[PDB]
């Protein structure tokens, strides 16, 4: 029922960013 | 071997925000 | 000290994804 | 870990309507 | 003069969705 | 884009939805 994410940690120019999805738990 | 994030959906001043740690899997 | 997420919930193609930032807190 | 709505405004029959998810923050 | 939503929650295929009115407040 | 990021509220039973109109 909540919205909770599940993303993964890649290196864009030398800084750690996170790219996920938002999924229903 | 990789890291992961796992986090919650937020609202903050009307928009929808991320908070999550980081985990290694 | 740990590594912590801190993003925004964006609506990309009709679903609900995640750009965030990794942060020291 | 309230009931939500998040939509988009379209334009039907010359009325402005609003088609979205309940989703729960 | 702001535009507001007022609509019914409807079960569409087992998820709760929103069909409703944009109107002028 | 115009986007609603708006409440649902239980009046009378029934689901109902109250929201303002943002621009994304």
Redesign the interface.
């Known amino acids: ?9 890649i290196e864009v120019g030398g ?8 999924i ?1 738990v």
Request: aromatic letters at 0%; charged letters at 40%.
């Open positions: 029922g909540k919205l909770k994410v599940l993303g993964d940690v800084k750690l960013k996170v790219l996920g999805d938002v229903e």
